[PDB]
Structure 1
Amino acid sequence: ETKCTLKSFTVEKGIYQTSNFRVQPTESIVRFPNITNLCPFDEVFNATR
């Protein structure tokens, strides 16, 4: 990781701050509020007349 950060196959003696080359797949989450209003298709399709 240090070698990639410094763009070289040889690194000198010392302390180096490296870049983050680590990868993780992570999750994917979607959230919505409760649907309670519905829609009056009953008066349309279940009509008595």
Structure 2
Amino acid sequence: QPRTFLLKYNENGTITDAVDCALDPLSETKCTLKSFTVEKGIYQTSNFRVQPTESIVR
């Protein structure tokens, strides 16, 4: 399933945690902000929620 993930590394090429974007508005904001920590405030997302459907050949 095509998704977008924010992979985090600890200077050793190993993932400590990953943000699953498009899962919910909270995670999508972290995906747009490119940071696991979000400061207090209002932010605008990049519309990662929607995904393309099956292509229609015509």
The TM-score with structure 1 as length reference comes to 0.50
Compare relative contact order (CA 8 Å, sep 6+) and give the higher one, 1 or 2: 1
Q: Which has the larger radius of gyration?
A: 1
Larger strand share, 1 or 2: 2
The TM-score with structure 2 as length reference comes to 0.43
